[PDB]
RNA sequence: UGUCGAACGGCAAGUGCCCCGAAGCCAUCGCACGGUGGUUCUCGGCUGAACGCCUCUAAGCCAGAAGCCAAUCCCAAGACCAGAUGCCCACU
């Protein structure tokens, strides 16, 4: 075993991380995010002068070390997530039948997809916005904002999964729903 | 067809036989009714290391089968219910 195996990860000037028992709270101008790694038994540091974020691991073998890495993009995604955010966009592509998207508030609606007569539904949580861009700048295009990166992917993976083709070749029929930027909102 | 003499009333033929026949029972031969949520498999994914890349996986997470569990339905305290309650008595 290894005796000492750290991870640093550099703060921004804004940005404030704090630990607490394996659970880190990172707070930006955008709002703040939480991440319970109770489930990890590493050790968190945070240095505030130097402004510096360090996990480390005593006495592990590889398989407790690869959650160090782990744990830092994790950090490192709940930072840029507090200072930039997250907007993943989706396209609708399809072939012969316009899906057609409605977006009320939270609730997402998907109609003809494939030229089928039921409507497929989505319930956004409330910290992801959806939203859907104006069809003369981009034609059907569904944008999600959020600070979490998991959340906001997990509302783009669910939209995804909403509409794959079931009983027909899938090289063929290429319909479906894709994200395809992932970007930050600021 | 016998038989009480006839008629009436019947009776006998272990319900004489034939027609119709209420009540009751009964026929998918008639009529009524037969629900809702979870945990997951296979699988597809998200975030993500190990392994500066990559990767559904290693930690974490999401969606999820006529399976499985519970709801509903049936029996139900030897499941010994210090659950509630009505009277009488005992103790007070
Ligand atoms: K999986
Ligand atoms: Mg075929
Ligand atoms: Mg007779
Ligand atoms: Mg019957
Ligand atoms: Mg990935």
């Not at 407790?64 to 396209?91: D, E, S, W």
């Not at 509409?163 to 992932?182: A, E, N, P, S």
Request: net charge positive.
């Amino acid at each position: 075993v290894k005796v000492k195996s750290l991870c640093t990860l550099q703060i921004p000037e804004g940005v404030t991380v704090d630990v607490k028992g394996r659970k880190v709270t990172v707070t930006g101008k955008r709002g703040t995010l939480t991440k319970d790694l109770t489930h990890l038994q590493l050790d968190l540091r945070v240095d505030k002068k130097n402004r510096t974020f360090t996990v480390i691991r005593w006495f592990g073998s590889k398989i407790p070390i690869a959650c160090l890495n782990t744990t830092k993009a994790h950090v490192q995604n709940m930072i840029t997530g507090v200072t930039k955010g997250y907007r993943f966009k989706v396209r609708c592509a399809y072939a012969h039948f316009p899906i057609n998207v409605s977006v009320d508030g939270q609730n997402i609606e998907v109609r003809n997809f494939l030229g089928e007569k039921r409507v497929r539904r989505q319930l956004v949580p409330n910290t992801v916005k959806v939203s859907q861009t104006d069809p003369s700048k981009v034609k059907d295009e569904i944008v999600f904002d959020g600070n979490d990166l998991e959340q906001v992917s997990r509302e783009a993976a669910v939209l995804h999964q909403m509409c794959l083709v079931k009983k027909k070749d899938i090289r063929k029929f290429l319909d479906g729903i894709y994200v395809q930027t992932k970007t930050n909102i600021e």
